[PDB]
Amino acid sequence: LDAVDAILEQWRRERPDLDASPMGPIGRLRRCAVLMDQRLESCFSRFDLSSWEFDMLATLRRAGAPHCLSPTELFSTLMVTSGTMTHRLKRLETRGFIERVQNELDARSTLVQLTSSGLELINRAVEAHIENERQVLSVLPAEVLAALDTNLAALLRGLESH
Amino acid sequence: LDAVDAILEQWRRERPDLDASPMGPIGRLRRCAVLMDQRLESCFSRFDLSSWEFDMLATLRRAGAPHCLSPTELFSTLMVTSGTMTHRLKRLETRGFIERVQNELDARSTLVQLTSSGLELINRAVEAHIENERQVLSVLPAEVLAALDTNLAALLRGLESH
Ligand SMILES: O=c1[nH]c(=O)c2[nH]c(=O)[nH]c2[nH]1
Ligand SMILES: O=c1[nH]c(=O)c2[nH]c(=O)[nH]c2[nH]1
């Protein structure tokens, strides 16, 4: 048994009138995601990056040269969505990783361009990030990791179809 | 394909020298967990509770009457771990949901006791939370949800064994 089985056993004792079985899968998902985040940010911290900072920089990098995206395009291609980007983009601009250039097709619009400093940083960070993620998943059998990847895609399909 | 497949395809184009396949399973895990959190907090908000507030209250509730736990016991039985509990416990005390009583076995120690207000709140919140989680998972086939639950337990086993 694990810590989520112990929690389900606590609810079998405290609220026997309720069926708390849906807590199982969701609890393990959220518990794994928090522990996974600690493993990832232990690598991101070597570059003075948070998780959202790496996400925004890697998203601009994935767009290809000249690594310039609109805020709408940037938001839609992030690995994980979140709240507004106003303050997060403002901090990345202060650190010199991104610059807000004026859209040539609309003067009253702005575009997000990865600077040459953020480009050199994100190219080094993505290399260490990939190797770090490989070490984390390395402890699982290949058949289990492939099944978890497929079952997570099924869960993601239902969440985004909502 | 999904949004994580599109990201993996972006890395196949931008860094063909790198193998970014470990990004797949971890990206879907973190993407699902964020979308799952939005579905959960859409129910927690009806009770003026955040995710960590529900976690701490449900943990004290799971301990059984008189719903009194030490900070070490409280931390070890939370669904998801996090940083320090100093400020989070201080806010719950201001809202009247918990009170810090003195340990009778150690005067220089404190215990966390769920008040009668937090007890009535968490008993109503856990009922709606369980029904909410059932509706979220209801869209998946039974065989897929059971396999995802087992594969997540395998992932959790490796993360906590680290
Ligand atoms: O291209 C990315 N790969 C990731 O693994 C990742 N993780 C994250 O948060 N953003 C991104 N972006
Ligand atoms: O008993 C709990 N069930 C949960 O589903 C849950 N989720 C959470 O964050 N804390 C808790 N506690």
Fold of B48-160: Arc Repressor Mutant, subunit A (1.10.10)
Task: Look up tokens 């006791």; give the residue.
Answer: B113
Length of chain A: 162
**Ligand 2 atom closest to residue A7's alpha carbon, by position in its atom list:** 1
Task: Kindly give the residue spans of alpha helices, DSSP state H, lying in chain B.
Answer: 3-14, 23-44, 51-62, 71-76, 86-94, 116-137, 142-160
* Rounded CA separation A81/B35 (Å): 8
AA identity, residue B127:
E
Point out the residue among B34, B61, B151 whose CB comes nearest to the CB of A148.
B151
Helix (H, G, I), strand (E, B) or coil at B139: coil
Whether residue A141 is preceded by a cis peptide bond, meaning omega within 30 degrees of 0, is no
Coil vs helix vs strand at A138: coil
Contact A51, A41 (CB under 8 A): yes
How far is the alpha carbon of B50 from chain A, nearest alpha carbon, in Å? Answer: 15
Closest CA to B20 of A12, A150, A137: A137
Closest by alpha carbon to B128, among B68, B58, B34?
A: B58
Q: Which ligand has its closest atom nearest to the C-alpha of A27?
A: 2
8 Å CB contact between A154 and B144: yes
Residue type, B88: R
Q: Which residues share a beta bridge with A113?
A: A68, A99
Taking the CA of residue B79 as reference, the ligand 2 atom at the shortest distance is 10
For chain B, give the number of residues: 162
Which pair of structure tokens corresponds to residue B32? 């699902």
Q: Determined by which method?
A: X-ray
Of the candidates A13, A157, A4, A27, which has an alpha carbon nearest to the alpha carbon of residue B51? A27
Q: How far apart are the first and last CA of chain A?
A: 32
CB A69 within 8 A of CB A63: yes
C-beta separation of A112 from A69 below 8 A = yes
Q: Which two tokens stand for residue A99?
A: 């610059």
What's the distance, CA A12 to chain centroid? Answer: 34
Strand partners, B69: B112
Burial class (CB in 10 A: 0-12, 13-18, 19+), A104: exposed
What CATH number was assigned to the domain covering residues A49-160?
1.10.10.10
Residue of B36, B127, B139 with shortest CB distance to A26: B36
Domain ranges of chain B: 48-160
Structure tokens at B76: 């070890």
- Cβ separation B22–A63 shorter than 8 A: no
A23 lines ligand 2 (CB under 6 A): yes
To one decimal place, what's the resolution in Å? 2.0
Helix, strand, coil in percent for chain A, rounding step 5: 65, 5, 30
Q: Do A14 and B64 touch (CB under 8 A)?
A: yes
List of residues 6+ apart from B47 with CB closer than 8 A: B54, B121, B124, B125, B128
Burial of A115 (0-12, 13-18, 19+ CB in 10 A): middle
**B6 C-beta neighbours (distance < 10 Å), count:** 12
Stated as kind and residue range, the H or E segment containing B47 is none
Nearest to B54 by CA among B78, B77, B81: B78
Residue pair B140/A158 in contact (Cβ under 8 Å)? The answer is yes
The Cα of B109 is separated from the nearest Cα of chain A by a number of Å equal to: 26
Would you give the DSSP letter of residue B20?
Answer: -
**Chain B CA closest to residue A148:** B151
Residues of chain B in contact with residue A27, where contact means CB-CB under 8 angstroms, are 79-80
